Amino acid sequence: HHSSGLVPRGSHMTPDFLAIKVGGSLFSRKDEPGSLDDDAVTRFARNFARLAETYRGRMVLISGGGAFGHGAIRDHDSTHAFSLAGLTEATFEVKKRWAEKLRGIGVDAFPLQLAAMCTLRNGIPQLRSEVLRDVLDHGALPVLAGDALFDEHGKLWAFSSDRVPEVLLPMVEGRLRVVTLTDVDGIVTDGAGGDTILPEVDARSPEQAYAALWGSSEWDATGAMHTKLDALVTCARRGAECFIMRGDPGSDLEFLTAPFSSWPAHVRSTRITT
Amino acid sequence: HHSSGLVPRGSHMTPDFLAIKVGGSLFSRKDEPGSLDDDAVTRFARNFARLAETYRGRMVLISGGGAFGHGAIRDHDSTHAFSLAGLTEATFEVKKRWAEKLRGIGVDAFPLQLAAMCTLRNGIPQLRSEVLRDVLDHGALPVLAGDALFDEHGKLWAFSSDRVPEVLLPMVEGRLRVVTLTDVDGIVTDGAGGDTILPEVDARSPEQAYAALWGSSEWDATGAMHTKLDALVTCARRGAECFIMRGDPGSDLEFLTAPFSSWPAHVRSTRITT
Ligand SMILES: Nc1ncnc2c1ncn2[C@@H]1O[C@H](COP(=O)(O)OP(=O)(O)O)[C@@H](O)[C@H]1O
Ligand SMILES: Nc1ncnc2c1ncn2[C@@H]1O[C@H](COP(=O)(O)OP(=O)(O)O)[C@@H](O)[C@H]1O
Ligand SMILES: [Mg+2]
Ligand SMILES: [Mg+2]
């Protein structure tokens, strides 16, 4: 036994940190190049702004790649992994669009290139720049996304926005809450369209959640729901309280500041914890 | 006296590392939003590619901001320094354009956001990400530019591409050569259009070079030739061999691999050294 700080945890406790990921499904048609739904971005931005005021210096916003990101991966030459470099430019564009919009409504939103801050070592992302912590300590809102990351052999890999919360794990003090907004209400069990949402998944033994999953579409290059589950199990096994739930641009999100047991009764999600 | 490695230096010696900065003047009209001269970019790229093959893992390309960068600074609200955040998006675009072009001709060019890697402390830029060194060690070509950088108090500052070589100084082993390509042949002495180029400046006492300088235009927000001189004096006082010289998109640049005393006789520059 190595000693560590005892962190009080539970459905009664308020999060110390929010990592909110917004799926591309919610503001982009993957099929349509350069699709960004500015109305969706605008409306979501307003809701993210309120969260960012409360979680000042205690939140990151993570954007999916949409048409920009999936397109970069679709269109690269798999025979030279370096052609994935275009992915970093593509996901920068999406971070830019979020950050611009947020700054227009008074949020100190700053896009950061994950590829400039993180590399892979034995498959595990490694935060290698102190700048993310400084930005948060200045009270700003980092806008992040997935990226093309170098490994220790110099090979580029496509690293989904869904996995970005993993990079926060050794950095974030106290209770991390990770919320992945998507186009489904959570992990649906008993049907490749629907039956019922699985309300709780135990990250120590999530075999039933994995049993529920179905395929990625043709348009999807980063593994859809399986990649989400893998990332959120990873985060939950390191103490995070994680959620898959439905995004909606005008939906109020202030309940994401609140302890889970105090959430409104209408809110549906899959919660992943240990 | 603290001991350090004795580095052989002189006009007879070949550089171990090349930092090539390409001024916005050379591929953008600052006055014209979104001006990027694709023919200039294409032609320069071809010449930079040959350098990058020889200096594989031993070179950075640094782009000026042109219309994108100067525009971001022109158009920000000086009453909230955070509105400078748009600068990081603007100079990312320019890095993207270079990197795209270079990759199209077989160079492993990867844009990196300086703001994600570097902060200011007591006015001195501090490299805070290990990713730049890794990228170079993988044999890739970092494409850099100026940026909006956070200081230790959370204030954003516009940091010119001209100063980017300063960030390399504690990282680069051996002989660094810094070449700033601009729209003049060097530091002109005896006239606010021309008289003669100052061929050599001693960084230990460069008072005559500073005496030669004239103003920034209306369009220029990062201090024109004075900022170049300040950056290159800084680098030279830490051992770099620095050059201000004229850029031209089709000009062959292979002589930039070569010891200074072996350069062609037609080449004009201001050389700054200690
Ligand atoms: N068991 C499941 N429950 C819910 N969604 C699932 C399941 N299995 C696969 N999926 C798919 O995962 C999709 C969400 O992932 P994805 O398409 O990548 O969206 P995002 O844009 O949020 O990353 C859903 O639209 C659904 O089609
Ligand atoms: N003594 C000098 N010698 C040469 N150029 C000078 C001098 N003083 C000022 N300058 C100005 O500096 C300019 C180059 O800096 P700048 O406009 O910022 O170009 P860049 O795009 O390379 O950064 C020249 O075009 C010139 O007008
Ligand atoms: Mg996805
Ligand atoms: Mg300049």
Automatic annotation (TrEMBL), chains A, B:
Binding-site residues for ADP 3, renumbered to this chain: S25, T182, D183, V188, K228
Entry binding sites for ATP: K21, V22, G23, G24, S25, G66, D183, A224, K228
GO molecular function list: ATP binding; glutamate 5-kinase activity; isopentenyl phosphate kinase activity
NCBIfam families to which the protein is assigned, alphabetical: fomA_AB016934.1.gene6
Keyword ATP-binding: yes
UniProt lineage: Bacteria, Bacillati, Actinomycetota, Actinomycetes, Kitasatosporales
Name of the protein in question: Isopentenyl phosphate kinase
Binding-site residues, ADP 2: S25, K30, T182, D183, V188, A212, W214, K228
CDD domains reported for this sequence: AAK_FomA-like
A cellular component annotation (GO) from this entry: cytosol
One example of a Gene Ontology biological process annotation: isoprenoid biosynthetic process
Residues annotated as domain Aspartate/glutamate/uridylate kinase: 18-245
Class of the enzyme per the UniProt entry, highest EC level: transferase
Keywords: ATP-binding, Isoprene biosynthesis, Kinase, Nucleotide-binding, Transferase
Site (Transition state stabilizer): K30
Lineage top rank: taxon: Bacteria
Residues engaged in binding ATP 2: K21, S25, K30, T182, D183, V188, K228
